[PDB]
Design a binder for this molecule. Structure first.
Ligand SMILES: O=C(O)[C@@H](O)c1ccc(O)cc1
Ligand SMILES: [Co+2]
Length: 346
C-alpha cells in the first residue's frame, strides 16, 4: 500500500466540548457528522488535518471501554491506500492483528482495520488520491473553512509521538517495518536529569505517516514516559505534531486563542547562538514564544509543546516548522522533554 493519513480519530467524553475546543482554540472547521444508534461523531478540518471526534452513546461502541480506561485520546490513525484488500492481506500475513476485514460497511469506499500499538488501531481506507474526501459514513463537505482563523494556519500532521511500555520499542518497530513497510529513519537515547528514554522513529514508505516511538530506559530512574503509561493506563499517543510555515507566528496566534505553551528558561536562549546560527527567525522572536531551534543534515527545525489540558494530563500537542529539516534533532528533543519536566516537577 502507499499510506497517507486519511484522518485521526479521538474518542471523547463530551462531543460538544471537544469539537468547540478544536474550533475555538485551534481554528478547525466543522466538515461533517456521523451518527448511529451507538455514537455521535464530527469530522473537523484544517489544511490537510482531518480530526474525527467520536462520543459513544451505547456500551456496544468500543469507545465506552476506551474512555473508561484512558479518558479522551487517540483511538484510530486511519490510513488512505489505493488497494485496501491487498494492504490488509499482506499486513495480516506479516503479523498484523486483524480487527476488521475489508468490506463496504456503510455507499462507502472499501474499508478494513488492523491493530497498531496498545489499543490504537489503523483503519485502512480505499482512496485513488484524486481529492480531499470525508471519512466514510459522514455527511457534509470538505469545502469548509473557519473565517475566524486569523493568523493560525496548521498545514497537516507531521508526526505522532507514542509512549510504549519498557521492552516494547524493538518489537513495535519491527511490526511497523514488516506488516506495513515502514522504515526506521531516526533514533535517540534521551536523558533528562536521572531519567532516560529510548526512542526510534518509523515512517511509511510514502513519507506521510511518522511515529516517534518512545519507551522508558529501565537503566535510569522512572520519569515522564512512566507517568504517561501509569496515568493513560497503557501505551498510547502522547502528542500529535502539526506543521506550520512559521512556528513563531503560530505560537502568537494560538496563544491569543487560549492555548498555553510550555516555558523554556532564558539560560537556553543564552546558550543558543554558540550552538546554532539561525536562518529564518530572530533569537528575540524565539525567546518571546519559547520556540526551540535545532538542525538536521537537511536544514532547520523549530518545535514547541503545548501544556496538556487533558484531565489526566496525558496527551498534548506540538507546533513544528521545518525549514529543510527532514527528521529531528537531539537538542530540540532534549529541550522539549526538559520543558515537560519543568512543567510537571517545577
Ligand atoms: O517531537 C519530537 O521531537 C519527539 O516527538 C521525538 C521523540 C523521539 C525521537 O527520536 C524523535 C522525536
Ligand atoms: Co514531537
Amino acid at each position: 500500500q502507499n499510506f497517507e493519513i486519511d484522518y485521526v480519530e479521538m474518542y471523547v467524553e463530551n462531543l460538544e466540548v471537544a469539537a468547540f475546543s478544536w474550533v475555538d482554540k485551534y481554528a478547525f472547521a466543522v466538515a461533517g457528522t456521523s451518527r448511529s444508534a451507538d455514537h455521535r461523531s464530527i469530522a473537523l478540518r484544517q489544511g490537510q488535518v482531518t480530526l474525527v471526534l467520536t462520543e459513544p452513546t451505547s456500551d456496544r461502541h468500543p469507545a465506552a471501554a476506551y474512555l473508561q480506561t484512558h479518558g479522551d485520546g487517540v483511538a484510530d490513525i486511519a490510513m488512505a491506500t489505493s488497494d485496501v484488500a491487498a494492504a490488509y492481506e499482506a499486513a495480516v500475513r506479516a503479523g498484523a492483528e486483524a480487527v476488521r476485514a475489508p468490506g463496504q460497511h456503510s455507499a462507502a469506499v472499501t474499508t478494513a482495520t488492523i491493530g497498531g500499538f496498545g489499543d490504537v488501531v489503523h483503519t485502512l481506507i480505499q482512496r485513488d488520491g484524486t481529492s480531499a474526501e470525508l471519512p466514510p459514513g459522514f455527511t457534509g463537505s470538505m469545502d469548509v473553512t473557519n473565517h475566524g482563523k486569523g493568523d493560525v494556519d496548521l498545514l497537516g500532521i507531521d508526526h505522532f509521538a507514542i509512549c510504549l511500555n519498557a521492552g516494547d520499542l524493538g518489537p513495535t518497530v519491527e511490526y511497523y517495518e514488516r506488516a506495513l513497510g515502514f522504515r526506521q529513519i531516526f533514533d535517540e537515547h534521551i536523558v533528562v536529569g536521572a531519567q532516560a528514554m529510548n526512542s526510534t522513529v518509523v515512517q511509511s514508505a510514502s513519507g506521510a505517516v511518522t511515529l516517534t516511538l518512545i519507551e522508558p530506559d529501565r537503566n535510569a530512574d522512572p520519569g515522564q514516559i512512566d507517568e504517561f503509561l501509569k496515568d493513560h493506563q497503557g501505551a498510547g499517543v502522547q502528542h500529535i505534531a502539526f506543521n506550520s510555515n512559521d512556528a513563531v507566528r503560530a505560537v502568537k496566534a494560538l496563544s491569543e486563542r487560549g492555548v498555553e505553551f510550555l516555558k523554556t528558561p532564558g539560560a537556553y536562549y543564552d546558550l543558543l547562538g554558540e550552538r546554532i546560527t539561525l536562518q529564518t527567525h530572530s533569537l528575540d522572536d524565539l525567546r518571546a514564544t519559547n520556540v526551540l531551534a535545532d538542525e538536521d543534515h537537511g536544514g532547520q527545525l523549530f518545535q514547541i509543546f503545548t501544556a496538556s489540558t487533558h484531565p489526566r494530563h496525558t496527551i498534548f500537542f506540538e507546533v513544528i516548522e521545518r525549514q529543510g529539516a527532514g527528521t529531528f534533532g537531539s537538542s530540540n528533543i532534549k529541550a522539549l522533554y526538559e520543558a515537560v519536566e519543568l512543567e510537571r516537577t517545577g
